[PDB]
Amino acid sequence: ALNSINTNAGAMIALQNLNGTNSELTTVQQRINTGKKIASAKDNGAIWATAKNQ
Amino acid sequence: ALNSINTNAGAMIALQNLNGTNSELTTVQQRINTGKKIASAKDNGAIWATAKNQ
């Protein structure tokens, strides 16, 4: 309503973008800790299985 | 990956060439200790057998 005192979409959208950035930071920190792109089976299943077998 | 922290091919290839040189040194030192090219039956079987019989 642009004057509503019960809600505001700006805060929700700002929250969503902040959480997106936090998830990206999680991924990069994982990449740094392990030293490789595909560490677990969640990153990429096909390539992970291939590397294990190889 | 040229920045991988888990592996590097340069070290492996350097190792392989170093081991090749070490094997060559083994052969030359054998040649010096015994005083002859074909000492054992591993050097050359045909010529070694010929020399024994002769």
Question: In this structure, are residues B31 and B37 in contact, taking their beta carbons and an 8 Å threshold?
Answer: yes
CB contacts of A36 in chain B (<8 Å) are 4, 6
State the method: cryo-EM
Question: In this structure, are residues B24 and B33 in contact, taking their beta carbons and an 8 Å threshold?
Answer: no
Radius of gyration of the CA atoms of chain A, in A: 19
Q: CA torsion angle for B31, B32, B34, B37 (degrees, to 10)?
A: 30
Amino acid in position B36: K
A32 touches chain B (CB under 8 A): no
CB contacts of A35 in chain B (<8 Å) are 4-6
Question: In this structure, are residues A53 and A45 in contact, taking their beta carbons and an 8 Å threshold?
Answer: no
DSSP of B1-54: --S-SS--HHHHHHHHHHHHHHHHHHHHHHHHHHSSS--STTT-HHHHHHHHH-
Instruction: Name residues whose C-beta falls within 8 Å of residue A43's C-beta, 6 or more positions apart in sequence.
Output: A37
* Chain-centroid distance, C-alpha A13: 17
Question: In this structure, are residues A38 and B6 in contact, taking their beta carbons and an 8 Å threshold?
Answer: no
Radius of gyration of the CA atoms of chain B, in A: 19
